[PDB]
């Protein structure tokens with residue numbers, strides 16, 4: 001009864017804003033000031049990474065291509081960390097700047113390489129902001145250092161994490177590298193959560209400045225279930241990783257993600273009048289992912305209604321002809337369009 005239908009309390013999170021989303025269903029499991037505009041600082045590089053990964057998916061350059069270091073990179077002499085102007089560095093090394101505390105010269109050199117100049121790269125960053133439908137994000141630079149006019153939000157930063165994993169998987173995989181070469185030198189990933197053994201963390205990006213505080217976007221899996229958290233304006237060194245750990249742990253403990261219906265699988269079959277065949281094959285045109293309270297998988301009910309009382313030919317492929325209802329304790333928790341899976345022409 002009441003233990004079945006219980007709504008879990010949200011833990012105390014010591015940050016200005018946060019969000020926890022399931023990667024597959026898009027469901028928000030917890031949120032606080034998730035839309036408030038804040039300085040993302042070096043989390044900016046998440047969008048930069050997105051654009052770079054789009055470039056590499058489109059075949060514009062490769063891991064093995066050589067980049068010339070411009071005076072651009074230098075303008076933002078005894079440290080081995082900095083790129084020397086006029087030197088040649090493979091793309092494979094520069095694009096790892098995402099895992100570093102700084103690496104902003106690499107960042108700028110890659111922007112020029114991919115887009116011709118910094119301003120045009122920022123142009124691409126901000127176009128992708130619109131293409132993803134983000135309402136509270138805007139960028140000024142590729143690295144996020146020099147421009148606390150730039151802003152984002154927990155929700156938007158989580159949605160950028162999502163797009164990274166979905167759209168550019170090959171670029172996303174750079175983020176879990178624990179150790180890697182940068183400028184001929186062995187370097188360590190800044191995301192400490194990569195070394196946590198209680199969770200399978202494989203992303204995404206950590207950052208800190210005094211104005212912005214501690215910020216982290218993390219992603220973890222348990223089974224076929226993936227969560228993303230964004231925690232922004234975290235208040236103490238102590239909590240920089242612990243706070244997000246608390247969020248992710250909570251989501252796995254109280255929620256699960258189920259996949260009741262896959263695209264192209266016959267959910268139901270219905271009589272067709274005046275057709276080639278007498279049978280309509282019905283399902284969905286998009287995979288169904290639902291996030292529900294953990295342990296409630298077997299009380300989940302699916303049923304459907306048709307838009308009309310009979311199906312007359314002709315019927316097109318992916319033609320919407322009804323609704324699939326998903327239910328938990330006779331409450332509708334999700335609806336999807338019910339489509340025809342196979343062309344049925346007239347008799």
Ligand SMILES: [Hg+2]
Pocket residue numbers: 045048049097098106107108110142143
């Ligand atoms: Hg970068």
